[PDB]
Design an enzyme around this catalytic site. Sequence first.
Site, PDB file in Angstrom:
ATOM      1  N   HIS A  41       0.716  -1.240   0.018  1.00 37.86           N
ATOM      2  CA  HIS A  41       0.236  -0.066  -0.130  1.00 37.86           C
ATOM      3  C   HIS A  41       0.674   1.124   0.013  1.00 37.86           C
ATOM      4  CE1 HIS A  41      -0.118  -0.560   4.441  1.00 37.86           C
ATOM      5  NE2 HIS A  41       0.410   0.641   4.587  1.00 37.86           N
ATOM      6  N   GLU A  72       0.805  -8.350   0.782  1.00 36.83           N
ATOM      7  CA  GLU A  72       1.087  -7.011   1.113  1.00 36.83           C
ATOM      8  C   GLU A  72       2.511  -6.696   1.354  1.00 36.83           C
ATOM      9  OE1 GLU A  72      -1.208  -4.900   0.805  1.00 36.83           O
ATOM     10  OE2 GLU A  72      -0.192  -3.153   1.814  1.00 36.83           O
ATOM     11  N   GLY A 146       1.514   5.595  10.882  1.00 36.34           N
ATOM     12  CA  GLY A 146       2.687   5.909  11.032  1.00 36.34           C
ATOM     13  C   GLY A 146       3.749   4.561  11.243  1.00 36.34           C
ATOM     14  N   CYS A 148       3.465   1.588   9.646  1.00 36.98           N
ATOM     15  CA  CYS A 148       3.477   0.740   8.663  1.00 36.98           C
ATOM     16  C   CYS A 148       4.927   0.465   8.199  1.00 36.98           C
ATOM     17  CB  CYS A 148       2.612   1.066   7.695  1.00 36.98           C
ATOM     18  SG  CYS A 148       0.934   0.877   8.105  1.00 36.98           S
TER      19      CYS A 148
HETATM   20  N1  LIG Z   1      -1.465   1.638  10.001  1.00 33.95           N
HETATM   21  C1  LIG Z   1      -2.218   1.257  11.299  1.00 33.95           C
HETATM   22  N2  LIG Z   1      -1.531   0.621  12.027  1.00 33.95           N
HETATM   23  N3  LIG Z   1      -2.459   0.261  13.115  1.00 33.95           N
HETATM   24  C2  LIG Z   1      -3.445   1.040  12.842  1.00 33.95           C
HETATM   25  C3  LIG Z   1      -4.915   1.365  13.260  1.00 33.95           C
HETATM   26  C4  LIG Z   1      -5.765   1.950  13.039  1.00 33.95           C
HETATM   27  C5  LIG Z   1      -5.499   2.483  11.814  1.00 33.95           C
HETATM   28  C6  LIG Z   1      -4.392   2.539  11.136  1.00 33.95           C
HETATM   29  N4  LIG Z   1      -3.241   1.681  11.735  1.00 33.95           N
END
Ligand SMILES: Nc1nnc2ccccn12
Length: 182
Positions: A41, A72, A146, A148
């Site tokens: 993504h 992914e 933040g 990922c």
């Molecule tokens: N990218 C990510 N990692 N954990 C979460 C939880 C909620 C929304 C986005 N998230």
Amino acid sequence: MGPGFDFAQAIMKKNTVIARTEKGEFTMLGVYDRVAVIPTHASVGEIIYINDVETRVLDACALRDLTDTNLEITIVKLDRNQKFRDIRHFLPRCEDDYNDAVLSVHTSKFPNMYIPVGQVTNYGFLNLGGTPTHRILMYNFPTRAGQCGGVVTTTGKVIGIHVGGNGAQGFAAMLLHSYFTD
Ligand SMILES: Nc1nnc2ccccn12
């Protein structure tokens, strides 16, 4: 703070870069030579920023399993003047559950971040942002936007990269030794 954090720090200090695409800033794990991984993504294109330096992408491959299901993980070969330390010997060979994992993130928003996430389940199937996804690991920590690309480790193993969460749990895509044979 203890030996899990020791292994996590050793990985972060030598085998990560900050990757920036049009979709954000990501923790990016370098695996060997000029080969790194990032969540699919991130939408890697022909050019990516690596520690704020414009870098040509030589190859980008969005992995799918042999059922043609999203994993992914995107494997990126970077036009960089320097190789990563080879860490392929720290990658698991098979799908598994784990105890006492750490999630480690390094971005402008979250520098030098380490999270003891505890037990990691081989979750398997996840509908991730509407996309059927396989080989998902789950941990019971309230991860956030933040994180990922964050690296999931145990002592002596690099087991996954963080790809999402539901507010109460976090989800990582497995890394397997077989993704990085050459
Ligand atoms: N990218 C990510 N990692 N954990 C979460 C939880 C909620 C929304 C986005 N998230």
